[PDB]
Design a protein around this ligand. Structure first.
Ligand SMILES: CCCCCCCCCC(=O)OC[C@H](COP(=O)([O-])OCCN)OC(=O)CCCCCCCCC
Ligand SMILES: CCCN(CCC)S(=O)(=O)c1ccc(C(=O)O)cc1
Ligand SMILES: CCCN(CCC)S(=O)(=O)c1ccc(C(=O)O)cc1
Lengths: 606, 95
């Protein structure tokens, strides 16, 4: 008969001779092995995929005659180029099976018979998402690289039948170098092997694609492999690309060039092409504003980024402290006008003070609306650590609202003016990042306590409200606690040490009211004891202090904002480093010179 | 042999849950063999592709549809500190 269920059971056994007569049946019916009648249910999976899933000692003897049988059947849609068609496995092919099963012998046999090396396995199983998936890029070459198969990578790249283009891209526009950056994990076993796989593909690009800058190829997000390593927070492959140095044929593939070395001292030129904030959507802008990861503070402390951000900071520290001094003068005027308010020359100076506060409030409102307009595409990333950018917008809104309510003469202007005065001085703590000692301490102090106190507050407020409605209900009968607010406040005073715990003489149920207070005190102090010990257990872990690097990231975010100037006076950006000849491409690049002194590393080479 | 019940009505898998023996419990629960012994498996790999394995797990004593099942035992009949480590094993975690 040679129906599908015979053919699929035949090719699974690995015996080629049981195919005898399949040619005659296909020709007599006028059918093809890639028509729906020869496919597995709820997909497009063919007899060739069924054959390649069942390799014996690295090969299946049915593949060569099955491919002739298709070739002799006169098929317009060849069996090697047929793909799965359902929403999960769309574009999956026998060549992607052959590569995942690690058979170079089967990859050769398929490609020799004209299997298209550029087929994209693009269905949802092969996309990157939080469910069950396996992203490898989408192409045979990207699969061979991510499964660590040099011999298959070499064969796909330089076979005579159909060479894999190193310029080829998946549905996201990712090249094999973006795919390797997507698949990097920051563990020493993954990252070292991804670094080798990346370097050998880049070195092969210099043979196979000699005029093509493979690391200047952009995906559909506009990211090169280096920019993608920053956005995805992949420190190990990021550090490797950023600091890469080679000798001999591959020197132009370097980003770092040693200029001289003498004793413990190395002087190196680093290539700033994608890196300097003079370029829009550069690596520094990405780490600061487009990267989601915990790793951002570890990325700004790498060379050249560390010395490059110190060089920018030193050019801007006088602008940082000028901006602080204007804000001190604004907060002095705010305070001298919030104090000296009238009952609700000195009078015209008070009016001047209100106009200066209105103008400083509009200036800050426009400056923060410009920040959130520029940061629109990544707006949550641009405030998740940078909470002051919201608190300056809030202080400016409340400053404009309070002057508006004062022009309306409604007395609710004063509690808004006083709230924006408090926020105004709390916002003065932003500038503590300008010095190492205060700026590292502002990073030591604020932590995981903000996450867990918001969890404890639910337990504390169910206790506080549950006991407040009870003490109010029971203190109603005669032989404190007058309302839900007053009982919540008397019960809250026990946590500030002002409890007023007593056997109330006039209440009918005074012993039960005292037992309700003793129940609240004991339960609340057990809860506070559980809360402090829970916080110590997570936060006193011995992890080495990462505050210097989180402060270096705060200074990086500050620099990359200051380089634009102000919303009204948009600064022309200076370009870092020098245009220097590093070799023959000549190979002239904006290089930045770093000098490293390292006795501890150098003495180990003696 | 694993459907033989002691005087408490427990099979070896149900006894490993009641006594809280995570290592032998995990082993029985996830057991896979090839060749002559495949029917002695509780786990059958359906397909494997790259970092992804798809497996069928046998729920016979396990699903709470049965009275005195492994899930009821870990929750309500087991005395041990280990109960919280047993509910986070596969298939119990996804189930
Ligand atoms: C529009 C044309 C007129 C321009 C006038 C001059 C503007 C100076 C701007 C400036 O110094 O702003 C500092 C501060 C905002 O700080 P930040 O943006 O770095 O950080 C913000 C947080 N990310 O903002 C302020 O302190 C408010 C500015 C108004 C008070 C000026 C007092 C001058 C005393 C000498
Ligand atoms: C600018 C003077 C640099 N010098 C060392 C500082 C005293 S140097 O000795 O001239 C030198 C050393 C090493 C290399 C090299 O490694 O290529 C080249 C030059
Ligand atoms: C439902 C499609 C499953 N596929 C992988 C997902 C792309 S598959 O490649 O067809 C395959 C892989 C491996 C095995 C096996 O290991 O037995 C069988 C089938």
């Amino acid at each position: 008969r040679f129906d599908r269920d015979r053919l699929f059971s035949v090719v699974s056994r690995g015996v080629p001779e049981e195919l005898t007569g399949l040619l005659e049946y296909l020709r007599w019916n006028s059918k093809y092995l890639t028509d729906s009648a020869y496919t597995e249910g709820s997909t497009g999976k063919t007899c060739l995929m069924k054959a390649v899933l069942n390799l014996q000692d690295g090969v299946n003897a049915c593949i060569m005659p099955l491919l002739q049988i298709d070739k002799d059947s006169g098929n317009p849609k060849l069996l090697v180029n047929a793909q799965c068609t359902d929403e999960f496995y769309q574009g999956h092919s026998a060549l992607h099976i052959a590569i995942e099963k690690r058979s170079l012998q089967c990859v050769k046999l398929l490609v020799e018979n004209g299997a298209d090396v550029h087929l994209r396995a693009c269905g949802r199983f092969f996309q990157k998402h939080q469910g069950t998936c396996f992203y490898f890029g989408e192409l045979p070459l990207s699969l061979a690289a991510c499964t660590k198969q040099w011999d298959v990578v070499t064969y796909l790249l330089e076979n005579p039948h159909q060479p894999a283009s190193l310029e080829a891209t998946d549905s996201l526009g990712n090249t094999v170098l973006h795919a390797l950056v997507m698949i990097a994990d920051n563990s020493p076993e993954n990252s070292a092997l991804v670094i080798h796989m990346y370097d050998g593909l880049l070195q092969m690009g210099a043979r196979l694609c000699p005029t093509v800058q493979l690391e200047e190829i952009s995906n559909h997000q506009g990211l090169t492999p280096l920019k993608l390593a920053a956005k995805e927070g992949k420190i190990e492959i990021f550090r490797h690309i950023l600091q890469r140095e080679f000798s001999g044929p591959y020197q132009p593939l370097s980003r770092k060039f040693t200029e001289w070395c003498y004793g413990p001292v190395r002087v190196s030129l680093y290539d700033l092409s994608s890196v300097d904030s003079w370029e829009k959507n550069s690596v520094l802008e990405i780490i600061a504003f487009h990267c989601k990861s915990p790793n951002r503070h570890r990325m700004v402390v790498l060379e050249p980024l560390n010395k490059l951000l110190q060089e920018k900071w030193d050019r801007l520290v006088s602008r940082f402290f000028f901006n602080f001094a204007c804000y001190l003068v604004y907060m002095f005027i705010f305070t001298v006008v919030a104090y000296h308010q009238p009952s609700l020359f000195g009078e015209s100076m008070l009016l001047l003070g209100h106009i200066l506060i209105l103008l400083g409030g509009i200036y800050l409102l426009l400056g923060q609306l410009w920040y959130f307009w520029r940061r629109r595409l990544f707006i949550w990333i641009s405030f998740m650590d940078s909470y002051f950018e919201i608190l300056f917008l809030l202080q400016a809104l409340l400053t404009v609202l309070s002057q508006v309510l004062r022009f309306m003469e409604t007395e609710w202007y004063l509690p808004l003016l006083v709230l924006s005065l408090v926020l105004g001085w709390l916002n003065l703590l932003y500038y503590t990042r300008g010095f190492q000692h205060t700026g590292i301490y502002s990073v030591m102090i604020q932590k995981v306590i903000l996450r867990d106190l918001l969890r404890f507050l639910l337990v504390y407020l169910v206790f506080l409200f549950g006991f407040a409605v009870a003490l109010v209900s029971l203190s109603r009968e005669a032989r404190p606690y007058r309302s839900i607010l007053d009982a919540s406040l008397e019960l809250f005073k026990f946590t500030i040490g002002m409890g007023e715990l007593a056997f109330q003489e006039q209440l009918r149920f005074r012993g039960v009211v005292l037992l309700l207070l003793l129940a609240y005190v004991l339960l609340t102090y057990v809860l506070l004891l559980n809360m402090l010990i829970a916080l110590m257990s997570e936060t006193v872990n011995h992890v080495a202090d990462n505050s210097w690097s989180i402060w270096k990231l705060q200074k990086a975010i500050s620099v990359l904002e200051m380089e634009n100037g102000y919303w009204w006076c948009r600064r022309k950006k200076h370009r870092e480093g020098r245009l220097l000849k590093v070799g023959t491409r000549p190979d002239e690049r904006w290089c930045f010179r770093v000098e490293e002194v390292n006795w501890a590393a150098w003495e180990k080479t003696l």
